[PDB]
Design an enzyme around this catalytic site. Sequence first.
Site, PDB file in Angstrom:
ATOM      1  N   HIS A   1       0.855  -1.218   0.000  1.00 47.43           N
ATOM      2  CA  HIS A   1       0.000   0.000   0.000  1.00 47.43           C
ATOM      3  C   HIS A   1       0.883   1.257   0.000  1.00 47.43           C
ATOM      4  O   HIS A   1       0.369   2.305  -0.204  1.00 47.43           O
ATOM      5  CB  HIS A   1      -1.050  -0.040   1.107  1.00 47.43           C
ATOM      6  CG  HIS A   1      -0.635   0.488   2.434  1.00 47.43           C
ATOM      7  ND1 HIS A   1      -0.319  -0.350   3.487  1.00 47.43           N
ATOM      8  CD2 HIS A   1      -0.530   1.759   2.892  1.00 47.43           C
ATOM      9  CE1 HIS A   1      -0.039   0.389   4.545  1.00 47.43           C
ATOM     10  NE2 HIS A   1      -0.154   1.703   4.201  1.00 47.43           N
TER      11      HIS A   1
ATOM     12  N   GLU B   1      18.695   7.801   8.427  1.00 50.11           N
ATOM     13  CA  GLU B   1      17.891   8.968   8.837  1.00 50.11           C
ATOM     14  C   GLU B   1      17.492   8.976  10.311  1.00 50.11           C
ATOM     15  O   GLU B   1      17.209   7.895  10.812  1.00 50.11           O
ATOM     16  CB  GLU B   1      16.537   9.049   8.118  1.00 50.11           C
ATOM     17  CG  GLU B   1      16.633   9.540   6.688  1.00 50.11           C
ATOM     18  CD  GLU B   1      16.975  11.013   6.538  1.00 50.11           C
ATOM     19  OE1 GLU B   1      17.408  11.622   7.523  1.00 50.11           O
ATOM     20  OE2 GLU B   1      16.810  11.534   5.436  1.00 50.11           O
TER      21      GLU B   1
ATOM     22  N   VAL C   1      16.352  17.408   8.412  1.00 45.80           N
ATOM     23  CA  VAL C   1      17.706  17.976   8.618  1.00 45.80           C
ATOM     24  C   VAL C   1      18.744  16.977   8.128  1.00 45.80           C
ATOM     25  O   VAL C   1      18.691  15.806   8.563  1.00 45.80           O
ATOM     26  CB  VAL C   1      17.931  18.311  10.102  1.00 45.80           C
ATOM     27  CG1 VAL C   1      19.350  18.868  10.336  1.00 45.80           C
ATOM     28  CG2 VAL C   1      16.852  19.260  10.623  1.00 45.80           C
TER      29      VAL C   1
ATOM     30  N   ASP D   1       0.093  -7.398   2.039  1.00 49.02           N
ATOM     31  CA  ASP D   1       0.579  -5.995   2.024  1.00 49.02           C
ATOM     32  C   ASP D   1       2.109  -5.996   2.179  1.00 49.02           C
ATOM     33  O   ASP D   1       2.619  -5.677   3.262  1.00 49.02           O
ATOM     34  CB  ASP D   1      -0.124  -5.159   3.098  1.00 49.02           C
ATOM     35  CG  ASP D   1       0.112  -3.684   2.919  1.00 49.02           C
ATOM     36  OD1 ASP D   1       0.636  -3.328   1.862  1.00 49.02           O
ATOM     37  OD2 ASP D   1      -0.246  -2.919   3.833  1.00 49.02           O
TER      38      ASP D   1
ATOM     39  N   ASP E   1       0.438   2.596  19.755  1.00 52.62           N
ATOM     40  CA  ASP E   1       0.196   1.997  18.420  1.00 52.62           C
ATOM     41  C   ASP E   1       1.132   2.598  17.376  1.00 52.62           C
ATOM     42  O   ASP E   1       1.791   3.630  17.624  1.00 52.62           O
ATOM     43  CB  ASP E   1      -1.278   2.188  18.044  1.00 52.62           C
ATOM     44  CG  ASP E   1      -1.868   1.178  17.070  1.00 52.62           C
ATOM     45  OD1 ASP E   1      -1.107   0.305  16.560  1.00 52.62           O
ATOM     46  OD2 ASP E   1      -3.098   1.277  16.823  1.00 52.62           O
TER      47      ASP E   1
ATOM     48  N   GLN F   1      -0.605   6.793  10.987  1.00 53.51           N
ATOM     49  CA  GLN F   1      -0.459   7.225   9.575  1.00 53.51           C
ATOM     50  C   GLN F   1       0.973   7.708   9.423  1.00 53.51           C
ATOM     51  O   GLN F   1       1.397   8.536  10.261  1.00 53.51           O
ATOM     52  CB  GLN F   1      -1.467   8.317   9.210  1.00 53.51           C
ATOM     53  CG  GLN F   1      -2.817   7.752   8.785  1.00 53.51           C
ATOM     54  CD  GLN F   1      -3.649   7.155   9.903  1.00 53.51           C
ATOM     55  OE1 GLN F   1      -3.743   7.708  11.011  1.00 53.51           O
ATOM     56  NE2 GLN F   1      -4.319   6.042   9.605  1.00 53.51           N
ATOM     57  N   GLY F   2       1.668   7.226   8.395  1.00 60.47           N
ATOM     58  CA  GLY F   2       3.069   7.613   8.114  1.00 60.47           C
ATOM     59  C   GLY F   2       4.077   6.575   8.560  1.00 60.47           C
ATOM     60  O   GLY F   2       5.268   6.672   8.145  1.00 60.47           O
TER      61      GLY F   2
ATOM     62  N   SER G   1       3.361   3.302   7.991  1.00 60.98           N
ATOM     63  CA  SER G   1       3.110   2.222   6.996  1.00 60.98           C
ATOM     64  C   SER G   1       4.423   1.781   6.356  1.00 60.98           C
ATOM     65  O   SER G   1       5.193   2.675   5.947  1.00 60.98           O
ATOM     66  CB  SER G   1       2.189   2.692   5.926  1.00 60.98           C
ATOM     67  OG  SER G   1       0.870   2.684   6.367  1.00 60.98           O
ATOM     68  N   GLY G   2       4.635   0.468   6.226  1.00 62.22           N
ATOM     69  CA  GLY G   2       5.771  -0.129   5.480  1.00 62.22           C
ATOM     70  C   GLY G   2       6.996  -0.324   6.347  1.00 62.22           C
ATOM     71  O   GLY G   2       7.983  -0.980   5.890  1.00 62.22           O
TER      72      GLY G   2
HETATM   73 CA   LIG Z   1      18.231  13.611   8.106  1.00 64.19          CA
END
Ligand SMILES: [Ca+2]
Length: 223
Positions: free
Chosen positions: A40, A52, A57, A84, A171, A174-175, A177-178
């Site tokens: 998805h 990251e 930044v 998925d 939990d 949103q964001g 995911s994956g």
């Molecule tokens: Ca960064």
Amino acid sequence: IVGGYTCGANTVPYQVSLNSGYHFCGGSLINSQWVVSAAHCYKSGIQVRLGEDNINVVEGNEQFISASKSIVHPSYNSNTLNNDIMLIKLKSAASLNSRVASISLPTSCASAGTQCLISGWGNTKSSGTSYPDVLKCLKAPILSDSSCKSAYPGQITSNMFCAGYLEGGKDSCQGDSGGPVVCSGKLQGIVSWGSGCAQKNKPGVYTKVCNYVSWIKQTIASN
Ligand SMILES: [Ca+2]
Ligand SMILES: [Cl-]
Ligand code: NA
């Protein structure tokens, strides 16, 4: 991640951010050239961002590599989110080090009660919206099949498990995911879906990665 904590810079060295001008999904590095994410999350124009912490930044440990090919699972159903899972090949091999490291694929499925680490840059609110720029972490147990099915009647396939807390407050969201669910050093889950976030009796639903190891290994071997 709702009700989690600040991971700390590069403490989750397999965590990737999928970027299409902005972070839109998590992923897990599984070797120098492949990322596992949610089907998805599929879209074109993906740039994989490794190393990251703050996604807003340049902190000095980033490797930015364009996806050369995406492979959505052959049996991915966008309506039910069954299967998925998607693989992304990097245009070039990531340089692997202490802060950019592959996560091991499971040799066996994890069992209910096993503690796992869920991570991502998703929403930190259960009601309303706030995106953190640094990676957030959650320690959550895998829930029983029977709990998971009770929580989501008619929706949980053999390719899904629930992890988290039926009391709510903690939990994925949103964001996220994956992104990864790592249980004793193995990728057992992919952040797939839920009913809202951190709601009572609505824990996170995760792609059961152990089901997909022979598909991942074969796909990698011929792509
Ligand atoms: Ca960064
Ligand atoms: Cl059960
Ligand atoms: Na390769």
